[PDB]
Amino acid sequence: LPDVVVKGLPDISRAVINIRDDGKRELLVEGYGLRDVMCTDGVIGSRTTTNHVLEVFSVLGIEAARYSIIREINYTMSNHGMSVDPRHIQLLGDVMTYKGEVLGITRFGLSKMRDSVLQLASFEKTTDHLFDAAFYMKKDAVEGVS
Amino acid sequence: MDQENERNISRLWRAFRTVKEMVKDRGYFITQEEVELPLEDFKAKYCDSMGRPQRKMMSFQANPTEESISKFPDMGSLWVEFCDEPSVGVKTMKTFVIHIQEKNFQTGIFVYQNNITPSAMKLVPSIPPATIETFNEAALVVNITHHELVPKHIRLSSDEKRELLKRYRLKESQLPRIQRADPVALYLGLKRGEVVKIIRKSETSGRYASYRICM
Amino acid sequence: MLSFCPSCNNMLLITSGDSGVYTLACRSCPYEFPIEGIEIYDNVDQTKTQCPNYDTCGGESAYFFQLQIRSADEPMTTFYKCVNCGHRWKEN
Amino acid sequence: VKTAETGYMSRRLMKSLEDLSCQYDNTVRTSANGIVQFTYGGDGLDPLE
Amino acid sequence: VRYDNSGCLVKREDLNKAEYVDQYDAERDFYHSLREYINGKATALANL
Numbered sequence A: 001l002p003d004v005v006v007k008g009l010p011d012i013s014r015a016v017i018n019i020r021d022d023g024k025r026e027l028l029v030e031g032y033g034l035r036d037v038m039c040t041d042g043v044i045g046s047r048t049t050t051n052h053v054l055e056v057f058s059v060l061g062i063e064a065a066r067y068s069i070i071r072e073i074n075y076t077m078s079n080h081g082m083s084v085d086p087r088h089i090q091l092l093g094d095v096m097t098y099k100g101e102v103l104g105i106t107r108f109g110l111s112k113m114r115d116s117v118l119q120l121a122s123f124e125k126t127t128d129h130l131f132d133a134a135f136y137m138k139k140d141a142v143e144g145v146s
Numbered sequence B: 001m002d003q004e005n006e007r008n009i010s011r012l013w014r015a016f017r018t019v020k021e022m023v024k025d026r027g028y029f030i031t032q033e034e035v036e037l038p039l040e041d042f043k044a045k046y047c048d049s050m051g052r053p054q055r056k057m058m059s060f061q062a063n064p065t066e067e068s069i070s071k072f073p074d075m076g077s078l079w080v081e082f083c084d085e086p087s088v089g090v091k092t093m094k095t096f097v098i099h100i101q102e103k104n105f106q107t108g109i110f111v112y113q114n115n116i117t118p119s120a121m122k123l124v125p126s127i128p129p130a131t132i133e134t135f136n137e138a139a140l141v142v143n144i145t146h147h148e149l150v151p152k153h154i155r156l157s158s159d160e161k162r163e164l165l166k167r168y169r170l171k172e173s174q175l176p177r178i179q180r181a182d183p184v185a186l187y188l189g190l191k192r193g194e195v196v197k198i199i200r201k202s203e204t205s206g207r208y209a210s211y212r213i214c215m
Numbered sequence C: 001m002l003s004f005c006p007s008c009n010n011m012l013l014i015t016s017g018d019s020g021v022y023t024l025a026c027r028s029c030p031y032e033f034p035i036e037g038i039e040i041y042d043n044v045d046q047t048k049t050q051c052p053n054y055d056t057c058g059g060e061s062a063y064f065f066q067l068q069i070r071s072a073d074e075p076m077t078t079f080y081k082c083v084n085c086g087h088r089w090k091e092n
Numbered sequence D: 001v002k003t004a005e006t007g008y009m010s011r012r013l014m015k016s017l018e019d020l021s022c023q024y025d026n027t028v029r030t031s032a033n034g035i036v037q038f039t040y041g042g043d044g045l046d047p048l049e
Numbered sequence E: 001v002r003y004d005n006s007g008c009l010v011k012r013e014d015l016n017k018a019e020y021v022d023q024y025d026a027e028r029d030f031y032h033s034l035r036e037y038i039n040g041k042a043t044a045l046a047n048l
């Protein structure tokens, strides 16, 4: 009995009220809520920000998500040191997003576009890609560098 | 409870704002006074004297104007109706389909209440000339394209399409794509093979544009 | 409720008695109960308006404060406070 | 410990972006001749020079 | 020059509006800022 939610959502781990900019004030919230807390009355949701881009794709999606992922990459890497320059960052987020869904760089997500079986069996895989391409009788082409 | 109820009538009123400004950029004809009203006029029109709002009387009709029927040669006015109870079933969707039958037009759109079930999913995409659209009241509060990061998405006709392919001299498709059922996609109601010009702003040279098709 | 029966000293659990009565007894040994069971575990600003709070009071004076809430188009919600009782009040 | 971790990140990042180039159409395209972007960085200027 | 939409020139208006894009603006803004830079040095000679 002394457990169940009286009010609020089933998301937030905790929140904080902090001093924003020079003299102003605002809050930061830890949770997966997003739109619901944006839909939550009492706050202007026009200008906001959220982490874990993949979920941002589930609300704003595509472009806005691509603009967010290049925003966070630039930020955290502009602190510790040196410079990665603006050019190289934009191309990294573009080749991931351009298909219309955010995925990549991982063996589960590395197969999206590329139809070449040898280069995919090169980076990471052994048995499956060779037998799978034989089953479905794939053809494709020899094109790329590797 | 008076408190939580006035929260919902402000919700639906702002939800009425969203579906209003949405029908404007599609090329259809309205005025700035149609999308802009205070709480006063809203309480008089769609809310009774008892203090409890209504549902079915919110239904209206709008048409296109000028260039909208020029640029896109095939188009016309539509018919929008609302829902009743969160539970979805055959019910009033029958006469809704019937309403589309004799009144023709293009796409009847209706805003949900709370829950969606496969019952109402019996037939979504019907009729030979056209189809319909589904929207939830929850998800709709403020417009996404106007929010922060989402830039202007400009839809173009078949004319500009083939010319764009005559610029870089390219075969069709093969361009950066855009998924459908995507909250931005379904917002503007894009069909198969429709190119939308996107103007984005990030700081290197500043403003620049790119093209993305719709799969 | 965490009770105990004397002698054997094991535990007491509620058992449904026949025809309307609710009782309890220790398991696998003769005993009978209940008695009544119980368990417990743990200002410058001023305005003129009519005060809804009434004992003998009927006070004239009141306090108020202004802030914007909800939507931008959504009107102002005002909070009222009374001099005598010091009661907080909220209405839009 | 950081020395052994250094090789994993950059490598797996490469194999994705490994094949890319810039044609005479100024559009950067892939091995499948699909166009990922019309102009590089919205400018076309190389950060090297 | 200028290219409006598809296979059409614009006229004497949208230059400021620039809703048609077509990019190449990186080339335009470079010439602009370069010109105004000389202007800033020129107007500096005025006050001097």
Ligand SMILES: [Zn+2]
Residues within 6 Å of the ligand: C004, C005, C006, C007, C008, C009, C010, C011, C026, C027, C029, C031
């Ligand atoms: Zn006992």
